[PDB]
Ligand binder design. Structure first.
Ligand SMILES: CCC(O)(CC)c1ccc2c(-c3ccc(OC)cc3)c(-c3n[nH]c4ccsc34)[nH]c2c1
Length: 240
C-alpha cells in the first residue's frame, strides 16, 4: 500500500506536534509533510482509507513509510498549515466572503465523504489544512474533544454523517470567529450540561443572520432535523 523507503525521506524542520509533523522532501524533490507516530496497524489503515478517497478538498498522501520504527505517513505539503492556526495568525485580515469560501471548501470535501459513507468522527478547524490561494482541505478523514461532538455522540457514541454536520457547525463557528476556542475555559461536563439545556455558541461579528441560521441548522438536537452535507453545500453557495 504505497511503501516508501526511509532513505527516500529528508527531514528538514519540525512543523507541528499532536503525532509529530516535519517539513521534508521525498526523493530530494517533492515538498512533503511527514507525520511520525495509537497502534501501528490503525495508523496504516487510516492512510489506506484516505489513499482511495480522491477529492480536490481532501488531503492527499504520497505514501507510507514502514519497516523502521517510528513509522510515518508521507502527506502532500500544505503551504499555510492547519486552518485553526491560520485563522488565529491572520485575524483581522479576513473578509466575510473569504470565511464563507473556507466553509464551502470543507463542505465540498464533506459532501464527497457523505456520499462515500465515510464518517470523519473528528471534524474541526485543527483537522483542516490551508494550501495555495487559501484552498481548504479536510485532513485526518480515515479514522475508525466533546466541544465538536453532537449530543448523540457525547452521550451514546452514535456516529453518522449527521454527527459530522454538527461538528461542521462548530467548524463554521471557528472560521467566522477567526480561530476562537469553542466554549473557552469550560470543562467537558460544563459543555454537555449547557448544550442539553439548549445553549448554543454565540453569533460571531463576521457571521450574518443567514450564516448563523445555517450554524443553528447544523446544531439541531435530533440528527434527522440537521441538513445533509449535499444540501448544506447548496445553502452556503446561495448565501454567497
Ligand atoms: C504555516 C507555517 C508553515 O508553512 C511552516 C512550514 C506550516 C506549518 C504547519 C504545517 C502543517 C501542519 C503540521 C502539523 C499539524 O498538526 C497536525 C497541522 C499542519 C502542514 C501540513 N501539510 N500537510 C499536512 C498533513 C498533515 S499536517 C500537514 N503544513 C504546514 C506548514
Amino acid at each position: 500500500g504505497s511503501v516508501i523507503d526511509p532513505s527516500e525521506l529528508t527531514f528538514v524542520q519540525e512543523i507541528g506536534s499532536g503525532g509529530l509533523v516535519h517539513l521534508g522532501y521525498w526523493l530530494n524533490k517533492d515538498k512533503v509533510a511527514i507525520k511520525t507516530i495509537m497502534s501501528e496497524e490503525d495508523f496504516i489503515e487510516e492512510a489506506e482509507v484516505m489513499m482511495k478517497l480522491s477529492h480536490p478538498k481532501l488531503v492527499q498522501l504520497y505514501g507510507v513509510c514502514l519497516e523502521q520504527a517510528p513509522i510515518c505517513l508521507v502527506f502532500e505539503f500544505m503551504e499555510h498549515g492547519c486552518l485553526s492556526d491560520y485563522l488565529r495568525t491572520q485575524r483581522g485580515l479576513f473578509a466575510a466572503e473569504t470565511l464563507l469560501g473556507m466553509c464551502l471548501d470543507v463542505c465540498e470535501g464533506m459532501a464527497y465523504l457523505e456520499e462515500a459513507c465515510v464518517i470523519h468522527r473528528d471534524l474541526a478547524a485543527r483537522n483542516c489544512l490551508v494550501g495555495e490561494n487559501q484552498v481548504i482541505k479536510v485532513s485526518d478523514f480515515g479514522m475508525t474533544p466533546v466541544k465538536w461532538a453532537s449530543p448523540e455522540v457525547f452521550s451514546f457514541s452514535r456516529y453518522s454523517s449527521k454527527s459530522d454536520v454538527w461538528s461542521f457547525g462548530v467548524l463554521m463557528w471557528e472560521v467566522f470567529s477567526e480561530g476562537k476556542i469553542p466554549y473557552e475555559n469550560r470543562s467537558n461536563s460544563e459543555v454537555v450540561e449547557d448544550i442539553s439545556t439548549g445553549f448554543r455558541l454565540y453569533k460571531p461579528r463576521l457571521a450574518s443572520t443567514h450564516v448563523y441560521q445555517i450554524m443553528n441548522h447544523c446544531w439541531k438536537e435530533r440528527p434527522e432535523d440537521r441538513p445533509a452535507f449535499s444540501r448544506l453545500l447548496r445553502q452556503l453557495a446561495e448565501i454567497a
